[PDB]
Design a protein around this motif. Structure first.
Motif, PDB file in Angstrom:
ATOM      1  N   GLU A 129      -9.287   6.358   4.149  1.00 52.61           N
ATOM      2  CA  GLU A 129      -8.870   7.097   2.963  1.00 52.61           C
ATOM      3  C   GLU A 129      -9.465   8.499   2.952  1.00 52.61           C
ATOM      4  OE1 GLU A 129      -7.773   8.031   0.169  1.00 52.61           O
ATOM      5  OE2 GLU A 129      -6.660   6.445  -0.859  1.00 52.61           O
ATOM      6  N   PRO A 130      -8.647   9.554   2.928  1.00 54.44           N
ATOM      7  CA  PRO A 130      -9.195  10.902   2.720  1.00 54.44           C
ATOM      8  C   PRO A 130      -9.857  11.029   1.357  1.00 54.44           C
ATOM      9  CG  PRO A 130      -6.954  10.995   3.597  1.00 54.44           C
ATOM     10  CD  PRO A 130      -7.197   9.576   3.185  1.00 54.44           C
ATOM     11  N   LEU A 134      -0.428  17.474   4.487  1.00 56.44           N
ATOM     12  CA  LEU A 134      -0.239  16.433   3.487  1.00 56.44           C
ATOM     13  C   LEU A 134      -1.369  16.453   2.465  1.00 56.44           C
ATOM     14  CD1 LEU A 134       0.939  13.509   5.811  1.00 56.44           C
ATOM     15  CD2 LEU A 134       2.263  14.691   4.069  1.00 56.44           C
ATOM     16  N   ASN A 135      -1.009  16.253   1.195  1.00 61.76           N
ATOM     17  CA  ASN A 135      -1.954  16.062   0.095  1.00 61.76           C
ATOM     18  C   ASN A 135      -2.905  17.243  -0.086  1.00 61.76           C
ATOM     19  OD1 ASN A 135      -0.971  13.651  -0.880  1.00 61.76           O
ATOM     20  ND2 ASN A 135      -2.542  12.353   0.071  1.00 61.76           N
ATOM     21  N   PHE A 142       0.687  11.095  11.097  1.00 58.83           N
ATOM     22  CA  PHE A 142      -0.296  10.989  10.026  1.00 58.83           C
ATOM     23  C   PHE A 142      -0.782   9.549   9.899  1.00 58.83           C
ATOM     24  CE2 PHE A 142       2.379   9.110   6.639  1.00 58.83           C
ATOM     25  CZ  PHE A 142       3.601   9.189   7.272  1.00 58.83           C
ATOM     26  N   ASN A 143      -1.247   9.162   8.712  1.00 53.87           N
ATOM     27  CA  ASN A 143      -1.735   7.808   8.470  1.00 53.87           C
ATOM     28  C   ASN A 143      -1.198   7.320   7.134  1.00 53.87           C
ATOM     29  OD1 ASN A 143      -4.041   5.974   7.090  1.00 53.87           O
ATOM     30  ND2 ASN A 143      -4.010   5.608   9.306  1.00 53.87           N
ATOM     31  N   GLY A 167      -1.235   4.091   4.791  1.00 53.29           N
ATOM     32  CA  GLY A 167      -1.832   2.805   4.488  1.00 53.29           C
ATOM     33  C   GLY A 167      -2.725   2.209   5.559  1.00 53.29           C
ATOM     34  N   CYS A 201       3.639   4.415   1.412  1.00 55.87           N
ATOM     35  CA  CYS A 201       2.752   5.419   0.844  1.00 55.87           C
ATOM     36  C   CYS A 201       3.573   6.624   0.408  1.00 55.87           C
ATOM     37  CB  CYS A 201       1.676   5.858   1.851  1.00 55.87           C
ATOM     38  SG  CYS A 201       2.373   6.663   3.311  1.00 55.87           S
ATOM     39  N   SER A 202       3.104   7.294  -0.639  1.00 53.32           N
ATOM     40  CA  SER A 202       3.750   8.485  -1.172  1.00 53.32           C
ATOM     41  C   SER A 202       2.766   9.645  -1.120  1.00 53.32           C
ATOM     42  CB  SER A 202       4.236   8.252  -2.605  1.00 53.32           C
ATOM     43  OG  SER A 202       3.197   7.744  -3.423  1.00 53.32           O
ATOM     44  N   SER A 203       3.182  10.750  -0.506  1.00 52.87           N
ATOM     45  CA  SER A 203       2.306  11.890  -0.282  1.00 52.87           C
ATOM     46  C   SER A 203       3.001  13.179  -0.708  1.00 52.87           C
ATOM     47  CB  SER A 203       1.876  11.975   1.190  1.00 52.87           C
ATOM     48  OG  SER A 203       1.272  10.767   1.621  1.00 52.87           O
TER      49      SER A 203
HETATM   50  C1  LIG Z   1      -1.955  11.107  -0.361  1.00 54.41           C
HETATM   51  O1  LIG Z   1      -2.600  10.671  -1.565  1.00 54.41           O
HETATM   52  C2  LIG Z   1      -2.035   9.480  -2.131  1.00 54.41           C
HETATM   53  C3  LIG Z   1      -2.744   9.245  -3.445  1.00 54.41           C
HETATM   54  O2  LIG Z   1      -4.155   9.271  -3.289  1.00 54.41           O
HETATM   55  C4  LIG Z   1      -2.187   8.329  -1.144  1.00 54.41           C
HETATM   56  O3  LIG Z   1      -1.612   7.146  -1.686  1.00 54.41           O
HETATM   57  C5  LIG Z   1      -2.630   6.120  -1.743  1.00 54.41           C
HETATM   58  O4  LIG Z   1      -2.611   5.305  -0.557  1.00 54.41           O
HETATM   59  C6  LIG Z   1      -3.624   4.287  -0.535  1.00 54.41           C
HETATM   60  C7  LIG Z   1      -3.509   3.591   0.801  1.00 54.41           C
HETATM   61  O5  LIG Z   1      -2.164   3.566   1.258  1.00 54.41           O
HETATM   62  C8  LIG Z   1      -3.438   3.340  -1.719  1.00 54.41           C
HETATM   63  O6  LIG Z   1      -4.491   2.383  -1.732  1.00 54.41           O
HETATM   64  C9  LIG Z   1      -3.436   4.123  -3.025  1.00 54.41           C
HETATM   65  O7  LIG Z   1      -3.153   3.253  -4.115  1.00 54.41           O
HETATM   66  C10 LIG Z   1      -2.396   5.239  -2.974  1.00 54.41           C
HETATM   67  N1  LIG Z   1      -2.429   6.024  -4.197  1.00 54.41           N
HETATM   68  C11 LIG Z   1      -1.337   6.301  -4.917  1.00 54.41           C
HETATM   69  C12 LIG Z   1      -1.554   7.119  -6.154  1.00 54.41           C
HETATM   70  O8  LIG Z   1      -0.222   5.911  -4.583  1.00 54.41           O
HETATM   71  C13 LIG Z   1      -1.516   8.695   0.175  1.00 54.41           C
HETATM   72  O9  LIG Z   1      -1.729   7.667   1.135  1.00 54.41           O
HETATM   73  C14 LIG Z   1      -2.067  10.019   0.706  1.00 54.41           C
HETATM   74  N2  LIG Z   1      -1.374  10.410   1.921  1.00 54.41           N
HETATM   75  C15 LIG Z   1      -2.003  10.670   3.072  1.00 54.41           C
HETATM   76  C16 LIG Z   1      -1.129  11.058   4.226  1.00 54.41           C
HETATM   77  O10 LIG Z   1      -3.223  10.593   3.178  1.00 54.41           O
END
Ligand SMILES: *[C@@H]1O[C@H](CO)[C@@H](O[C@@H]2O[C@H](CO)[C@@H](O)[C@H](O)[C@H]2NC(C)=O)[C@H](O)[C@H]1NC(C)=O
Ligand SMILES: *[C@@H]1O[C@H](CO)[C@@H](O[C@@H]2O[C@H](CO)[C@@H](O[C@@H]3O[C@H](CO[C@H]4O[C@H](CO[C@H]5O[C@H](CO)[C@@H](O)[C@H](O)[C@@H]5O[C@H]5O[C@H](CO)[C@@H](O)[C@H](O)[C@@H]5O)[C@@H](O)[C@H](O[C@H]5O[C@H](CO)[C@@H](O)[C@H](O)[C@@H]5O)[C@@H]4O)[C@@H](O)[C@H](O[C@H]4O[C@H](CO)[C@@H](O)[C@H](O)[C@@H]4O[C@H]4O[C@H](CO)[C@@H](O)[C@H](O)[C@@H]4O[C@H]4O[C@H](CO)[C@@H](O)[C@H](O)[C@@H]4O)[C@@H]3O)[C@H](O)[C@H]2NC(C)=O)[C@H](O)[C@H]1NC(C)=O
Ligand SMILES: *[C@@H]1O[C@H](CO)[C@@H](O[C@@H]2O[C@H](CO)[C@@H](O[C@@H]3O[C@H](CO[C@H]4O[C@H](CO)[C@@H](O)[C@H](O)[C@@H]4O)[C@@H](O)[C@H](O)[C@@H]3O)[C@H](O)[C@H]2NC(C)=O)[C@H](O)[C@H]1NC(C)=O
Ligand SMILES: *[C@@H]1O[C@H](CO)[C@@H](O)[C@H](O)[C@H]1NC(C)=O
Ligand SMILES: *[C@@H]1O[C@H](CO)[C@@H](O)[C@H](O)[C@H]1NC(C)=O
Ligand SMILES: *[C@@H]1O[C@H](CO)[C@@H](O)[C@H](O)[C@H]1NC(C)=O
Ligand SMILES: *[C@@H]1O[C@H](CO)[C@@H](O)[C@H](O)[C@H]1NC(C)=O
Ligand SMILES: *[C@@H]1O[C@H](CO)[C@@H](O)[C@H](O)[C@H]1NC(C)=O
Ligand SMILES: *[C@@H]1O[C@H](CO)[C@@H](O)[C@H](O)[C@H]1NC(C)=O
Ligand SMILES: *[C@@H]1O[C@H](CO)[C@@H](O)[C@H](O)[C@H]1NC(C)=O
Ligand SMILES: *[C@@H]1O[C@H](CO)[C@@H](O)[C@H](O)[C@H]1NC(C)=O
Ligand SMILES: *[C@@H]1O[C@H](CO)[C@@H](O)[C@H](O)[C@H]1NC(C)=O
Lengths: 226, 291, 211
Positions: B62-63, B112-113, B221-222, B224, B276-278
């Motif tokens: 997780e970033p 991303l993000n 990218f990554n 989940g 995942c949504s970014s």
């Molecule tokens: C960009 O940020 C979002 C939100 O922080 C990331 O979505 C999260 O992904 C993790 C793991 O897949 C989940 O446990 C969280 O619940 C997600 N959060 C939301 C609000 O959906 C997303 O993965 C990030 N993208 C990148 C490429 O790092």
């Protein structure tokens, strides 16, 4: 709407072309799918193959280098040509209209679907028997009656199945009760029809049974009276 | 490895030493085609290159917002100029003990993000007239990206030593499908248009977008926990004088991290479905006649 | 194809489970095949029925993966006795050339009916043709299982008699023929000939004499 009626030799010798035909009614031949299905005694339903509205061939791999499902659109007629037949090929052959459905589950662009086929209207069925034994015509013998009485006709020693029995060419249809046949140890089937009739019409309402046996080109009739 | 197919990931079987050093078991597992190479018999892609370490299935990728602070007696200087290009003199400076919340997002071709820009979108470079110098474009309004691996996978624990448990992949429950992404065709159309606007303020001409010249060729990218490799050709295919855009992403489990000294990492498989949504807030371009 | 036996009671609800459960998203067909008769398309899509099929024939859709395909027949009749097939089309398995196995539904608790024996003496033309035949006709009996005994005067025959396996009728009762072949002199040399059809736990007699 749409109905179908098959028609075949009824008897084909071993190692031979089991030709067949199926004419459809009230429908265009070239805008639907058409499936051939047979069903032997002891076995279940078996999907032979099917032709498309594009006249594309696709057979059951169970039947190796044997099936060829043709079609001629001048009429409403499509055929079926099994060859190199054997004893296990005896079955009732059905002609049904197949329709195509496209079951999408994922993305249509990625190819995440599959095609399923369902038959919605069927033909009546053509009985086909395979044996080196030659065909045989029957021989009817009347059965004379005894408030209500019963009389009929005895269709003795024919081959192969089936025979059709009408009464007064089709007029007398109430109370008629044609029975299943009997495969005698001699190799010939035997059928017996019987009609329950009011005892008042015994003298005299003329009664004649119409016997038809297609593999012998025979059409016989016989009267019944005390 | 003795690998089958499915319909893409192989179905591979192999003898392995177990917890007892002299007994052999024959396990089966799935490996994506990018993780294996023919020698039919197969092997893992790294074995003629480097030792591979399985990523611990409890550490997260997780970033997390990381703040960088200067020591006592030092200082970091900010720049509040809302149109600041990469270099020069910033006329709105402020001092900070630490930087803002920075997410160490490992990405490629598409940022991303990240942090958006204020006012309008800005493009940066060193010597933009030098073609061998990457262009860092920063967006002012993110375009929504939605990625997913729809296959419902299962995780299998294989004891290949005292305490050493290799997590593999086995069997896809339900439909077999395709890992992909989604961005809005309109929002990427208006945003590519904004990127086209400032490719005039630095140039004169026509603005053509094409595909790259699978780590770098595709958006990597990554999502989940599994590393996608999304083909971005339906993204950069335009010439400027409802609808979703979908990229066909592949999935790798073995990555060469950054360098190539001789250490690779095996990402253990994630169980179930992945989505995942970014936010794509940046872009890394590279310009190469009359156009 | 082999047969799976199923027993429900008259009026209850039938639950025919498919013998080949799906691996992915499915499109299951249900066919009602009565033996030696035209099959009837009951349900083509997972739960869609054609025109002319009662509401009591219901199929299970696949909204959430996991729910197996079953055929539900509510308010079972006697005419619902037939074979049933499960044509399984799913995304994982290839092309469904084969129909389902077989689920022969047998309805229990039906009205028991007694046979209507009818015996005819040998015909006039065949007696002239040097061959005799007694035809003992049985019809409208349930459950369809009878045993036939022939008596030459008072002595059993057992020699030269054929018997049909009980076939079904339109009114869902059964029928079966019974031919006793005699020589034209054997038929005349005996005083009487009887036909005993003992259906269930009772016998009915029908005798005929050469007069
Ligand atoms: C960009 O940020 C979002 C939100 O922080 C990331 O979505 C999260 O992904 C993790 C793991 O897949 C989940 O446990 C969280 O619940 C997600 N959060 C939301 C609000 O959906 C997303 O993965 C990030 N993208 C990148 C490429 O790092
Ligand atoms: C990222 O970007 C991606 C790309 O943009 C994007 O991809 C999309 O992903 C989603 C999900 O992954 C996909 O959604 C699926 O879509 C499937 C296709 O649905 C379409 O087609 C059907 C069928 O169309 C035929 O029938 C209708 C009438 O029935 C006719 O009017 C049509 O003309 C057509 O008939 C002709 O065409 C046939 C060829 O297909 C010929 O065979 C035929 O002879 C004719 O010539 C339509 O019904 C759908 O309409 C629905 O949508 C419209 C909007 O367009 C709405 O008004 C309304 O809601 C309609 O319902 C549509 O047009 C679907 O099959 C699929 O849903 C089924 O499958 C899933 C899983 O498999 C099931 O869980 C789900 O329940 C559905 O199953 C039902 O249906 C099947 C088959 O019918 C049954 O067997 C089953 O029992 C079940 O029935 C139950 O529900 C029915 C209602 O649905 C009901 O009728 C039954 O009675 C019962 O209750 C799924 O939705 C989508 O396709 C992708 N997009 C593309 C472009 O591919 C993705 O989303 C993006 N985002 C991400 C990834 O996050
Ligand atoms: C990847 O390849 C693997 C092989 O390397 C696949 O694993 C095999 O999958 C098949 C089905 O596709 C299994 O076969 C089934 O086995 C079960 C178990 O029954 C057995 O045991 C009973 C004793 O009660 C015995 O009587 C049976 O005859 C069987 O021997 C059966 O119920 C099934 O009918 C069928 O035979 C293999 O067992 C299985 N092997 C292993 C080692 O797991 C795997 O499915 C493939 N996966 C993918 C996604 O492609
Ligand atoms: C495991 O070793 C045996 C040794 O006889 C061999 O036959 C077998 O093929 C090996 N398994 C695999 C997956 O190669
Ligand atoms: C390892 O094998 C691959 C085969 O795909 C080859 O491309 C690569 O150059 C090899 N590397 C070394 C260091 O041998
Ligand atoms: C992406 O942008 C939306 C819209 O402002 C925001 O709600 C969401 O928190 C953002 N996600 C990340 C990880 O920055
Ligand atoms: C940034 O602006 C300065 C002057 O404000 C200019 O000299 C420099 O070239 C600009 N940077 C780029 C990459 O154009
Ligand atoms: C930029 O690069 C060009 C050649 O690509 C060179 O001629 C020019 O001097 C460079 N300018 C700067 C400021 O580095
Ligand atoms: C994935 O498969 C598991 C069983 O392996 C099941 O419990 C779960 O519901 C499935 N999830 C989806 C989204 O189909
Ligand atoms: C991405 O997903 C979010 C939440 O599921 C949704 O609000 C947004 O419209 C989606 N955008 C695209 C381009 O798919
Ligand atoms: C990306 O997709 C395009 C078509 O959409 C295809 O021609 C190209 O080969 C793909 N890229 C790779 C690396 O396969
Ligand atoms: C676009 O994607 C989002 C989520 O990825 C989805 O909800 C929406 O239905 C998709 N629209 C189309 C037209 O595919």
């Amino acid at each position: 709407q749409v109905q179908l009626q098959e028609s075949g030799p009824g008897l084909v010798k071993p190692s031979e072309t089991l030709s067949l035909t199926c004419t459809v009614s009230g429908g265009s031949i070239s805008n639907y799918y058409w499936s051939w299905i047979r069903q032997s005694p002891g076995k279940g339903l078996e999907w032979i193959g099917y032709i498309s509205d594009s006249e594309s061939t696709n057979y059951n791999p169970s039947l190796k280098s044997r099936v060829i499902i043709s079609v001629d659109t001048s009429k409403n007629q499509l055929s079926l040509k099994l060859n190199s037949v054997t004893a296990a090929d005896s079955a009732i052959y059905y002609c049904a209209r197949a329709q195509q459905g496209k079951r999408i589950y994922g993305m249509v662009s990625f190819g995440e679907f599959f095609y399923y086929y369902y038959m919605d209207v069927w033909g009546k069925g053509t009985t086909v028997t395979v044996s080196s034994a030659s065909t045989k015509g029957p021989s009817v013998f009347p059965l004379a009656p005894s408030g209500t009485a019963a009389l009929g006709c005895l269709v003795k020693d024919y081959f192969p199945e089936p025979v059709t029995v009408s009464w007064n060419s089709g007029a007398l249809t109430s109370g008629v009760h044609t029975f299943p046949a009997v495969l005698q140890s001699s190799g010939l089937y035997s059928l017996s029809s019987v009609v329950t009739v009011p005892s008042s019409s015994l003298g005299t309402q003329t009664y004649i049974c119409n016997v038809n046996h297609k593999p012998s080109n025979t059409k016989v009739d016989k009267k019944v009276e005390p | 490895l003795n690998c089958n197919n499915v319909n893409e990931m192989k179905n591979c079987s192999f003898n392995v030493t177990t917890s007892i050093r002299d007994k052999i078991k024959k396990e089966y597992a799935l490996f994506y085609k990018l993780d294996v190479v023919p020698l039919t018999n197969y092997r893992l892609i790294n074995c003629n290159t480097s030792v591979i370490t399985q990523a611990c299935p409890k550490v997260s990728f997780e970033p997390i917002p990381i703040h960088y602070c200067a020591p006592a007696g030092f200082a970091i200087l900010k720049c509040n100029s809302k149109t600041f290009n990469g270099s020069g003199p910033c006329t709105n400076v402020s001092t900070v003990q630490c930087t803002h919340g920075i997410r160490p997002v490992v990405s490629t071709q598409l940022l991303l993000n990240g942090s958006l820009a204020e006012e309008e979108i800005v493009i940066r470079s060193e010597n933009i007239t030098d073609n061998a110098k990457t262009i860092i474009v920063q967006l002012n309004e993110a375009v929504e990206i939605n990625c997913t691996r729809p296959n419902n996978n299962t995780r299998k624990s294989i004891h290949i030593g005292p305490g050493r448990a290799f997590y593999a992949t086995g069997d896809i429950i339900g439909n077999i499908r395709q890992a992909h992404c989604n961005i809005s065709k309109a929002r990427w159309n208006e945003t590519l248009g904004q990127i086209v606007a400032k490719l005039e303020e630095q140039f004169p001409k026509t603005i053509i977008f094409n595909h790259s010249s699978p780590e770098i060729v595709t958006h990597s990218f990554n999502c989940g926990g599994e590393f996608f490799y999304c083909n971005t050709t339906p993204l950069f295919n335009s010439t400027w004088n409802e609808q979703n855009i979908t990229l066909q992403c592949r999935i790798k489990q073995i990555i060469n991290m950054w360098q190539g000294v001789g250490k690779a990492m095996y990402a253990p498989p994630i169980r179930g479905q992945i989505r995942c949504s970014s936010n794509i807030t940046g872009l890394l371009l590279t310009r190469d006649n009359g156009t | 194809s082999y047969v799976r036996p199923l027993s429900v009671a008259l009026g209850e609800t039938a639950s025919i489970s498919c013998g080949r459960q799906a691996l992915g998203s499915r499109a299951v067909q249900w066919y009602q095949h009565r033996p030696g008769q035209a099959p009837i398309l009951l349900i083509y899509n997972n739960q869609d029925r054609p025109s002319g099929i009662p509401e009591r024939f219901s199929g299970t859709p696949d909204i959430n993966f996991g729910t197996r395909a079953t055929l539900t027949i509510s308010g079972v009749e006697a005419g619902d006795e037939a074979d049933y097939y499960c044509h399984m089309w799913d995304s994982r398995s290839g092309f469904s050339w084969s129909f389902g196995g077989a689920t022969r539904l047998t309805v229990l608790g039906q009205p028991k009916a007694a046979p209507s024996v009818t015996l005819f003496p040998p015909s006039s033309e065949e007696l002239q043709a040097n061959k005799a035949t007694l035809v003992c006709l049985i019809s409208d009996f349930y459950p369809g299982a009878v045993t036939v005994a022939w008596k030459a005067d008072s002595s059993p025959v057992k020699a030269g008699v054929e018997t049909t396996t009980p076939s079904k009728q339109s009114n869902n009762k059964y029928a079966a023929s019974s031919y006793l072949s005699l020589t034209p002199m054997q038929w005349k040399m005996h005083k009487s000939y009887s036909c005993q059809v003992t259906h269930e736990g009772s016998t009915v007699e029908k005798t005929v004499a050469p007069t």
